């Protein structure tokens, strides 16, 4: 896991290990990558993308915190006019004077504590550290890095953008965070660990304007 | 191009959204269901169709005295050949 | 062309309702480009008649009102080009 | 950037081969099966399939009997 423990807190350590049992970190990473690749396949034609290549990731890449690699690679069939590195929420981005053919995409999961739960800053720092670094190998200098804070359920990306990419990734991240199975499983595990539950709406008492449903296929009883 | 502005736009706008269409067929069976695909002839392959038609009990008395009843049957996946289509209709 | 979806459907037990109301339940063997449907292990109920078992049938493609496919069909890998 | 300008209707949905909408729990079940490389047991597969056909039989559809017996 990519969770860092400052101090040996055995209670918290066992709780977290139980929460993340069965390679949940890697399962989440895999799920996110597949969802993004699927959405890209869906909007391929509209975004003028030749193909989506699932970069062959190293098995221990999900929690490889010190370095990184590329996860998805978009083959263009053309040359896109790309933008300067801007936040995923940066509604105004200036175009860089360069064009590319391969557009790579990296996913980084984090467990941010109170001090450092700023996903935007983390994404910026990691993108400009890994791209410039000697140990991190990327296919092209042009690409995007997307950081997801699990502990706070936050999302944001920083790298370059070509037309359509920014809105597409914005909505795709929205829907992924809303309905990813691995994320849902982690959320439910955390809820179980905290024994914190949500409540219910009683159910509308049958009124004269609601009795009409009594004669549907579902079998109903009056006591 | 003009695949999406012709009169088959009722079908290619209903297969994109996967909404249900009502089809009055030629033998006056009514097909309610979602278009999985269509073509030039409106050969619509459909999923989850309610086929609703009318009957009478056809002189069960012997004196030809009965009222028409609404019958329907469910079909899971069908390939409706599109000559028998009279009208396809997107839902309100 | 959607008929090309049907000729990918070799060896499926489908029923076919025709324009004469006759329901034909059998394993489809061949489709033309004009939907000329050749069937085997045929249980044909001509309507207003009792159903007849026949070993082979060949419906002309014009006279098909509709098909009825079973539950277990993977059409998302069948209607691709 | 001079964006294109449109509404991308993104839908993320998990479906079984038969085309039924998949609940997230069994979606992750299938994901984990494919991930580890080993599926469920024969008994569990049989139970699951019998449940599916039970749902189908129930959905595809004694007052007269009680009236006659009264």
């Amino acid at each position: 896991t990519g969770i860092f423990m400052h101090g040996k807190i055995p209670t918290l350590k066992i709780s977290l290990i139980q929460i993340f049992r069965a390679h949940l970190w890697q399962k989440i990473h895999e799920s996110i990558v597949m969802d993004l690749c699927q959405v890209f396949d869906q909007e391929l034609d509209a975004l003028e993308i030749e193909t989506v290549q699932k970069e062959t990731i190293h098995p221990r890449k999900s929690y490889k915190m010190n370095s990184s690699c590329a996860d998805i690679l978009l083959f263009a069939s053309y040359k896109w006019n790309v933008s300067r590195p801007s936040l995923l929420a940066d509604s105004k981005d200036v175009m860089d004077s360069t064009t590319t053919q391969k557009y790579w995409i990296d996913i980084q999961l984090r467990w941010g504590d109170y001090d450092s739960h700023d996903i935007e800053r983390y994404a910026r720092a990691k993108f400009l550290d890994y791209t410039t670094d000697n140990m991190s190998i990327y296919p092209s200098p042009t690409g995007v890095l997307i950081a997801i804070d699990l502990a706070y359920n936050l999302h944001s990306a920083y790298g370059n953008w070509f037309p359509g990419s920014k809105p597409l990734i914005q909505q795709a991240m929205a829907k992924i965070m809303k309905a990813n199975p691995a994320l849902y499983v982690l959320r439910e595990r955390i809820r179980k660990g905290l024994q914190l539950y949500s409540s219910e709406p009683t159910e509308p008492y049958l009124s004269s304007q609601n009795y009409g449903e009594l004669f549907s296929n579902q079998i109903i009883w009056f006591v | 191009e003009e695949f999406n502005t012709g009169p088959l736009s009722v079908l290619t706008q209903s297969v994109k959204n996967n909404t249900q269409v009502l089809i009055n067929c030629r033998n006056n069976k009514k097909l309610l269901g979602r278009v999985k695909a269509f073509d030039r002839h409106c050969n619509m392959v459909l999923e989850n169709v309610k086929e609703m038609w009318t009957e009478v009990p056809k002189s069960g008395k012997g004196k030809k005295k009965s009222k028409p009843v609404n019958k329907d049957r469910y079909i899971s996946k069908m390939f409706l050949r599109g000559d028998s289509v009279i009208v396809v209709l997107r839902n309100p | 062309k959607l008929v090309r979806f049907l000729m990918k459907l070799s060896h499926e037990t489908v029923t076919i309702e025709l324009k004469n109301g006759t329901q034909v339940h059998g394993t489809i063997t061949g489709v033309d480009v004009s939907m000329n449907t050749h069937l085997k292990a045929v249980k044909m109920t001509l309507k207003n008649r009792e159903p007849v078992q026949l070993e082979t049938l060949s419906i002309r493609g014009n006279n098909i009102r509709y098909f009825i496919l079973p539950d277990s069909l993977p059409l998302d890998t069948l209607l691709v080009d | 950037k001079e964006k294109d300008g449109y509404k991308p209707d993104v839908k993320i949905e998990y479906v079984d081969e038969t085309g039924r909408k998949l609940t997230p729990k069994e979606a992750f079940r299938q994901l984990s099966h494919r991930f580890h490389g080993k599926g469920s047991g024969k008994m569990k597969t049989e139970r699951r399939m019998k449940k599916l056909d039970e749902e189908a039989l129930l959905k595809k559809m004694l007052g007269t009997v009680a009236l006659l017996q009264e």
Binding site: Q26, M34, I57, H58 | - | - | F35, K38
Partner: peptide, 21 residues
Amino acid sequence: VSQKRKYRQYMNRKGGFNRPL
């Protein structure tokens, strides 16, 4: 329409450390 998700394998592969396609 929709298609069953195509996930990769990590454990008990007998293959190279890197992913297949």
